[PDB]
Amino acid sequence: WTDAEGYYRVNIGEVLDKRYNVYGYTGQGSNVVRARDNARANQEVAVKIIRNNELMQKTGLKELEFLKKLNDADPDDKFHCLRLFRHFYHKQHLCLVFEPLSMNLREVLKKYGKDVGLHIKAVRSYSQQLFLALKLLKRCNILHADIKPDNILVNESKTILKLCDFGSASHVADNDITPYLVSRFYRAPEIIIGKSYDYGIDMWSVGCTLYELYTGKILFPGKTNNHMLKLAMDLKGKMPNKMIRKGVFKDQHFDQNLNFMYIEREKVTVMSTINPTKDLLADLILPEDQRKKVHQLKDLLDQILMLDPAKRISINQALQHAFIQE
Numbered sequence: 001w002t003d004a005e006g007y008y009r010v011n012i013g014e015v016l017d018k019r020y021n022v023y024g025y026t027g028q029g030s031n032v033v034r035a036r037d038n039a040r041a042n043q044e045v046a047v048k049i050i051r052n053n054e055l056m057q058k059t060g061l062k063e064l065e066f067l068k069k070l071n072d073a074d075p076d077d078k079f080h081c082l083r084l085f086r087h088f089y090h091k092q093h094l095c096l097v098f099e100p101l102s103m104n105l106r107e108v109l110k111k112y113g114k115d116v117g118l119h120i121k122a123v124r125s126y127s128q129q130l131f132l133a134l135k136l137l138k139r140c141n142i143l144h145a146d147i148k149p150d151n152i153l154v155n156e157s158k159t160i161l162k163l164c165d166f167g168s169a170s171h172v173a174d175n176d177i178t179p180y181l182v183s184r185f186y187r188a189p190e191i192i193i194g195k196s197y198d199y200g201i202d203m204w205s206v207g208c209t210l211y212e213l214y215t216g217k218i219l220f221p222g223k224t225n226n227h228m229l230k231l232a233m234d235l236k237g238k239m240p241n242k243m244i245r246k247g248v249f250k251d252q253h254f255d256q257n258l259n260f261m262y263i264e265r266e267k268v269t270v271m272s273t274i275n276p277t278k279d280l281l282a283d284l285i286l287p288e289d290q291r292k293k294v295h296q297l298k299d300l301l302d303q304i305l306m307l308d309p310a311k312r313i314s315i316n317q318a319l320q321h322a323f324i325q326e
């Protein structure tokens with residue numbers, strides 16, 4: 001029944017936990033299936049079937065405890081985090097029963113068109129809901145470590161979003177010194193440099209997502225960790241000297257004179273100063289009411305995209321920003 005890799009071979013029409021009748025797909029190789037709960041008047045549910053093996057089962061149980069913690073902390077469901085209904089085992093696989101949702105934000109952008117992006121009013125509502133998710137994430141001692149359009153789901157009417165996929169989530173007391181934490185394009189500079197990180201990494205990831213939600217394009221589509229720093233410095237300039245010294249992977253990107261080494265058949269180029277060339281306003285941009293809102297988003301992105309997490313806009317200040325309050 002289980003694959004060599006550890007995946008479960010799902011069947012359309014199969015009944016899970018003697019109640020969940022699987023009727024459709026959402027995404028296969030953990031496999032997420034759409035089911036109807038026969039015990040609860042055929043109500044729609046999403047069942048996440050976690051991969052077997054050894055390492056995947058550990059992350060599944062880790063996902064279970066984090067979702068339970070966030071759900072108990074938010075009884076009224078006003079902090080936009082995915083709702084776990086219950087859990088069961090099926091043919092050695094841990095199965096998580098979730099609230100049913102329509103599509104992820106990556107899927108909605110594809111339906112919006114090639115580099116079209118969402119309407120400024122939708123981006124405004126989505127940002128507030130994402131900032132509310134960060135508030136609950138910070139209230140609990142949880143780091144999502146994978147905020148991106150693929151991991152944010154929306155309801156049928158596309159009015160309510162939910163932060164999903166807590167498979168790569170971690171506790172704040174846990175400080176794993178890894179430069180590969182968070183999907184590369186949404187990876188904060190403090191992860192890459194090897195600096196002590198906190199809730200700011202999730203804030204950075206939200207900023208990358210908010211630019212992508214309006215433009216339909218990835219903010220920093222870097223090939224490697226070094227290219228990610230170059231693209232981040234192409235907007236805000238060179239990283240502050242006090243931040244570079246605090247890191248662990250200092251030597252891998254910066255020399256003894258604190259100058260950045262850009263990689264382009266190896267090709268290494270020494271850079272003393274990086275001038276801010278990337279124009280957010282030009283890349284983001286019709287009516288005066290909408291134009292004023294794009295300018296407010298631009299100022300909010302400037303405050304989120306600060307290289308030093310200590311200079312980064314807080315969750316409360318992001319919620320109170322002119323772009324949200326109108």
Ligand SMILES: Nc1ncnc2c1ncn2[C@@H]1O[C@H](COP(=O)(O)OP(=O)(O)NP(=O)(O)O)[C@@H](O)[C@H]1O
Nearest residue numbers: 026027030032046098099100101104150164165167
């Ligand atoms: N509650 C849900 N309702 C409807 N679809 C869901 C739900 N949760 C997940 N999905 C779908 O399944 C996809 C992947 O789910 P996810 O939680 O990311 O499992 P995963 O594939 O193991 N993790 P990953 O692909 O690394 O983010 C999501 O992008 C959705 O398309």
Ligand SMILES: [Mg+2]
Nearest residue numbers: 027028029030
């Ligand atoms: Mg997947």
